[PDB]
Amino acid sequence: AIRKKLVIVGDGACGKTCLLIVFSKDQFPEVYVPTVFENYVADIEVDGKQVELALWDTAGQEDYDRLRPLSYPDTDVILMCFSIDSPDSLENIPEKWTPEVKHFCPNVPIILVGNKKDLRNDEHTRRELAKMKQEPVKPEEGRDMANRIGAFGYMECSAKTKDGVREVFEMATRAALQA
Amino acid sequence: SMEMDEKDFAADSWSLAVDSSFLQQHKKEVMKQQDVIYELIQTELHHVRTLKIMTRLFRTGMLEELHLEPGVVQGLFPCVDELSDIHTRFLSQLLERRRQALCPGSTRNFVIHRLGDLLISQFSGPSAEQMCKTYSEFCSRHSKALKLYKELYARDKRFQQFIRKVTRPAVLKRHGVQECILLVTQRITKYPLLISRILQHSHGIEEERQDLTTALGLVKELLSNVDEGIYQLEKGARLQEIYNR
Numbered sequence: 001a002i003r004k005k006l007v008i009v010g011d012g013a014c015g016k017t018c019l020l021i022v023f024s025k026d027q028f029p030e031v032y033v034p035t036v037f038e039n040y041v042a043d044i045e046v047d048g049k050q051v052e053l054a055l056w057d058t059a060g061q062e063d064y065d066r067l068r069p070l071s072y073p074d075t076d077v078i079l080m081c082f083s084i085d086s087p088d089s090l091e092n093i094p095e096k097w098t099p100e101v102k103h104f105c106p107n108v109p110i111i112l113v114g115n116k117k118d119l120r121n122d123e124h125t126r127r128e129l130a131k132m133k134q135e136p137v138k139p140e141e142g143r144d145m146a147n148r149i150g151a152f153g154y155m156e157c158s159a160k161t162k163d164g165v166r167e168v169f170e171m172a173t174r175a176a177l178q179a
Numbered sequence: 180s181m182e183m184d185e186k187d188f189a190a191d192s193w194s195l196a197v198d199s200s201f202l203q204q205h206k207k208e209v210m211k212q213q214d215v216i217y218e219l220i221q222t223e224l225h226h227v228r229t230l231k232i233m234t235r236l237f238r239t240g241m242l243e244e245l246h247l248e249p250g251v252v253q254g255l256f257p258c259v260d261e262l263s264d265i266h267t268r269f270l271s272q273l274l275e276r277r278r279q280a281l282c283p284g285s286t287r288n289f290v291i292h293r294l295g296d297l298l299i300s301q302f303s304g305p306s307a308e309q310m311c312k313t314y315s316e317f318c319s320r321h322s323k324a325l326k327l328y329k330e331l332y333a334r335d336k337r338f339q340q341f342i343r344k345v346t347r348p349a350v351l352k353r354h355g356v357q358e359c360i361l362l363v364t365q366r367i368t369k370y371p372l373l374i375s376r377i378l379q380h381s382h383g384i385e386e387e388r389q390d391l392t393t394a395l396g397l398v399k400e401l402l403s404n405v406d407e408g409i410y411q412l413e414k415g416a417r418l419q420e421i422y423n424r
């Protein structure tokens with residue numbers, strides 16, 4: 001099994017911590033959802049290849065520009081996250097997160113991930129966003145941003161229901177294995 | 180970690196650690212506050228364990244088994260004794276607050292009502308100055324430690340055999356040398372997230388809400404000072420590269 005490193009980046013409200021927790025336990029916690037994620041090494045077999053995929057979160061480092069880059073050395077794949085219930089999290093992708101990741105992780109594949117996809121058709125979410133002249137992120141808006149930023153691909157998931165979570169990490173493993 | 184503390188923090192939450200008959204005596208808001216305090220102590224116990232792997236398994240094993248050049252082990256594990264002293268002392272205070280709160284006849288049923296004062300003490304005065312000095316030094320030497328590790332693993336056979344030997348057990352799966360270094364660098368930025376969530380469930384006693392608000396501010400001040408005090412050291416960097424920063 002070859003060792004690969006994955007780092008997830010995105011705004012504080014993007015759901016990156018929850019996504020790593022749900023994947024690493026293969027379960028949305030029924031009693032207590034942890035506030036933080038330390039690290040994890042997942043055993044993944046994708047397209048017949050066995051990989052040990054180390055997972056890291058950047059939560060808590062968003063305001064600290066000299067501490068945050070210490071998470072990037074030798075990263076093999078980046079998950080760049082935004083929440084579908086937050087068009088503001090999607091607007092910060094191209095000129096804040098993307099230039100930083102391209103600088104510290106040159107030539108590393110980026111997968112743009114739309115989290116909380118279950119909220120796209122949530123009535124409470126649609127009412128709250130409409131007060132700021134907003135609506136949940138549409139799939140084409142996500143794909144277009146991924147295309148513009150030079151992402152390897154665009155994917156969506158819901159940590160709450162687990163839908164799409166396995167597929168995101170299997171694809172990240174395939175991206176980490178490419179030349 | 181020692182078995183007594185591992186068993187006390189084996190459960191995924193405070194609500195699963197205490198007896199169900201004790202859990203049922205508390206209101207939902209108390210259970211939510213205690214679950215987050217339990218996560219702060221449990222993650223602190225694991226952080227002190229990461230530092231013990233670095234000092235006892237790696238650092239001391241390299242000194243006792245290998246023939247490394249002088250200054251190489253200090254380069255791989257900068258400030259680890261100072262970091263161990265800071266966090267073992269903090270963990271001791273957290274565990275003593277829990278132990279004093281136990282019900283007589285129980286080794287698992289407790290409620291911690293007064294964490295804020297302990298956090299203000301940790302993140303103020305000389306202990307905060309030592310945390311700031313130690314993390315500014317450690318985090319500035321982080322890139323250099325990773326590069327030194329990679330060079331030794333690729334070129335020294337006895338070093339590669341030593342690493343493969345001591346990291347083979349399944350309990351070391353997440354704790355290779357580079358993984359330990361990044362776990363330590365990331366620890367300090369977990370504190371505001373944990374403290375803010377404890378504060379969210381600590382409004383019942385106004386003195387406690389005020390104390391956690393003060394602690395959160397002190398932790399953010401420490402992080403801002405550490406972040407401003409970092410500049411990565413590079414082996415063989417020339418003075419001209421430094422003054423042209």
Ligand SMILES: CN(C)C(=O)c1ccc(F)cc1Br
Pocket residue numbers: 069070072073074104105322411
């Ligand atoms: C001076 N120095 C080591 C860097 O700027 C750096 C480079 C790459 C990386 F992934 C993280 C960092 Br921090």
